[PDB]
Design a binder for these strands. Structure first.
Ligand code: MG
Ligand code: MG
Ligand code: ZN
Ligand code: ZN
Lengths: 56, 98, 168, 65, 189, 49, 49, 38
DNA sequence: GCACAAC
RNA sequence: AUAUCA
DNA sequence: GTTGTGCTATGATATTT
């Protein structure tokens, strides 16, 4: 995570198969290619903490 | 003349399975040699009949090689800190070419 | 400073002994038991102490005491720091050097860099990413398996009370 | 590891054509392109299927118990 | 542990290790939340780290059955070390050194097993047989080199390592009838 | 199949394409801890275990 | 309907590598923790964070 | 100065296919019976 | 193996 | 500790 | 002038005593 666009708040879509799926135009700031790259998800636990994600 | 190339592959050597075992066996045999001497003193003092089986410790060279080959720290276990690790890896069996 | 930091306290006279949490023990199977390196290093300090105490009490042979003092000096010193320049390391049977206190705080993976300034966390997940042109920009495809594991503790109010009862 | 039944890509039954193939190369002494054509492997998806198959099962059979 | 809500005498409880919880299988009440991995925790005591790079490796395993509880490190050479201070601090350990010395009879058993080509499990039974019978009044005054020669056949007779008594007569020493009576007064203990 | 990923014929997959066998081997010892303590191979009963 | 462009097409030798997704995917909302630091344990196989 | 056998010393691990290994002078059919891959 | 910091 | 992954 | 002293990419995963 080299800059703040390497952590961005997303909107869950529950889908099948074992991959995280992201829109391609969002590849540029995560610097992700799909050659076996893995990524990290963190779930906020507070009503307050999700507001920080969604608003900021 | 010009400064010698420190990278010239001709002025390099490769220590393979032979010499690696030779290096280890030397330090392992001098380990045994000087443990027999410690015994010859102990058995000439009390004239306890220099029993051969008591004199030579087989486990010295046996487990001394087994350690190196297993773990990979090419030295004794003493000494397992100051000894170079990396020699002896578990062989790849992914694909025949690997 | 007259209250918190006087020069005379740079010299150790009494030794605070940390409690088990700082140096955990483990009791495996009645013939296997694991003690922390600190518990080892402490026992040496103690043994070296008990020794020097007996020497002073008895007929003090001057040079056999200062010989035992600079042993105590070593064990106490090596316990806070084992990576000392000039001095031999205290080693632990297997040839490995004792993990001093200094060394637990020090590096990345230390208590600072690796347990406080960054730490692993719950409610997290990781997997392979793949591209999807049929998602929105701000969405993310989450495998049903992960979504079933990860949790959000919503609080029951009379708004969600019906919905939550169905979930339960 | 045994001739696959059915070509991957297109799905023509290809697993019945093995013994018949090796006969064309051994008994009749035809070259491969000709043999594959005689068999009825028209499109290259089915040709690669037989042309490329390695019969390891024959190696595995050599171990006794 | 027993569920405070239910209380049935056979307390049926599960260790849902994966969620790190201890649950009552009947009512489902969680009885504990802090739960630790014992495998990985034991990895911190007995590891493969001999070099000294692992920050996880922070302790060492000991054997309270054989050597009691004698915690003690050894002054040795490190990376930046003068060969002078090692000698002094070691010559200083010499002045600090009876039954705390009869543990060198373990060194007699270890050097006998290695001369008899015996496994690591046999030595530790011979050392436990010797620790629990060398100060007995039932053995009283038996030939002290024939009671440790008898505790090696006691350690072999449990570790399933076939060693005849005449095989240990060749090692040391053994006086036959002397280490045969001693192999029985211990066998009763 | 954008950005290094790729599409694969799900029908071809069914017909055998790129399937593989997988074998993992689990080991276990029956260790002897001194004069008395010995591990055992058995089906544990939940009341005394 | 025809594609307006023509496509490069043909056999290419392709290798099935290690790293399958079901050997990597990993989620954890609370679970085992280290005994020293009381933080989660490390490793997919330890069910850590 | 006037004056008044063969001993085991250790077990050395052998490298497979070496002179000392059983598999060195082994034929193809031989290896198969030995449950080794040629 | 740096590169800069104190003896 | 080695190997490896982007 | 010489010595001596800190550090030297992020996360992940799989074995071996
Ligand atoms: Mg990339
Ligand atoms: Mg890119
Ligand atoms: Zn086809
Ligand atoms: Zn209950």
């Amino acid at each position: 995570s080299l800059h703040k666009m390497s952590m961005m708040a997303h909107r869950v879509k529950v889908i099948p198969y074992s991959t995280f799926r992201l829109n391609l135009s969002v590849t540029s700031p995560y610097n992700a290619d799909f050659d076996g790259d893995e990524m990290n998800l963190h779930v906020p636990q507070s009503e307050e903490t999700r507001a920080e994600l969604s608003q900021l | 003349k010009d400064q010698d190339d420190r990278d010239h592959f001709g002025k390099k050597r490769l220590d393979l399975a032979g010499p690696l075992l030779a290096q280890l066996f030397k330090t392992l045999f001098k380990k045994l040699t000087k443990d027999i001497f410690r015994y010859m003193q102990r058995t000439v003092e009390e004239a306890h009949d220099f029993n051969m089986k008591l004199a030579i410790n087989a486990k010295t060279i046996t487990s001394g090689l087994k350690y190196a080959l297993a773990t990979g720290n090419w030295g004794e276990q003493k000494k397992a800190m100051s000894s170079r690790a990396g020699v002896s890896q578990v062989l790849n069996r992914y694909t025949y070419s690997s | 400073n007259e209250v918190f930091s006087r020069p005379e306290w740079m010299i150790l006279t009494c030794l605070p002994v940390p409690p088990p949490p700082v140096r955990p023990s483990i009791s495996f199977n009645e013939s296997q038991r694991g003690e922390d390196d600190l518990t080892f290093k402490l026992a040496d300090i103690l043994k070296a102490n008990i020794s020097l105490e007996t020497l002073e009490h008895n007929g003090a042979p001057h040079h056999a005491i200062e010989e035992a003092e600079s042993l105590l000096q070593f064990h106490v010193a090596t316990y806070m720091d084992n990576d000392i320049a000039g001095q031999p390391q205290a080693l632990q049977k297997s040839g490995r050097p004792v993990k001093s206190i200094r060394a637990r705080l020090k590096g990345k993976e230390g208590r600072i860099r690796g347990n406080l300034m960054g730490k692993r966390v719950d409610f997290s997940a990781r997997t392979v990413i793949s591209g999807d042109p049929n998602l929105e920009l701000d969405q993310v495809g989450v495998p049903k398996s992960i979504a079933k594991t990860l949790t959000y503790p919503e609080v029951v109010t009379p708004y969600n009370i019906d919905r939550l009862t169905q979930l339960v | 590891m045994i001739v696959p039944v059915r070509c991957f890509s297109c799905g023509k039954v290809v697993g019945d054509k093995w013994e018949s193939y090796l006969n064309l190369l051994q008994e009749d002494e035809l070259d491969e392109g000709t043999a594959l054509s005689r068999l009825g492997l028209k499109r290259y998806c089915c040709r690669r299927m037989i042309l490329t198959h390695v019969d390891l099962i024959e190696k595995f059979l050599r171990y006794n118990p | 542990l027993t569920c405070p809500e239910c209380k049935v005498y056979p307390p049926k409880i599960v260790e849902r290790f994966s969620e790190g919880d201890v649950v009552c299988a009947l009512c489902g009440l969680v009885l504990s939340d802090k739960l630790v991995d014992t495998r990985s925790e034991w990895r911190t005591f007995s590891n493969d780290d001999h070099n000294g790079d692992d920050p996880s490796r922070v302790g060492e395993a000991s054997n309270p059955l054989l050597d009691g509880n004698n915690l003690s490190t050894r002054i040795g050479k490190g990376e930046t070390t003068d060969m002078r201070f090692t000698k002094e601090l070691n010559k200083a350990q010499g002045k600090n050194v009876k039954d705390n010395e009869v543990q060198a009879a373990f060194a007699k058993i270890t050097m006998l097993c290695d001369a008899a080509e015996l496994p690591k499990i046999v030595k530790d039974c011979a050392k436990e047989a010797y620790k629990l019978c060398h100060d007995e009044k039932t053995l009283k005054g038996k030939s002290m080199e024939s009671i440790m020669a008898a505790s090696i056949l006691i350690g072999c007779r449990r570790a399933e390592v076939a060693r005849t008594f005449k095989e240990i007569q060749s090692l040391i020493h053994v006086k036959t009838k002397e280490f045969g009576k001693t192999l029985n007064i211990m066998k009763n203990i | 199949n954008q950005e290094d990923s790729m599409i694969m014929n799900q029908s071809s997959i069914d017909r055998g394409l790129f399937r593989s066998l997988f074998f993992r081997s689990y080991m276990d010892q029956e260790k002897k801890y001194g004069m008395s303590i010995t591990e055992t191979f058995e089906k544990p009963q939940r009341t005394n275990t | 309907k025809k594609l307006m462009a023509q496509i490069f097409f043909g056999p290419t030798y392709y290798q099935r590598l290690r790293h399958m997704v079901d050997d990597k995917i990993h989620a954890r909302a609370r679970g085992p923790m280290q005994v020293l630091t009381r933080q989660p344990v490390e490793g997919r196989s330890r069910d850590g964070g | 100065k006037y004056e008044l056998g063969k001993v085991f010393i250790g077990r050395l691990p052998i490298m497979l296919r070496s002179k000392n290994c059983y598999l060195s002078e082994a034929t193809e059919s031989d290896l198969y019976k030995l449950k080794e891959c040629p």
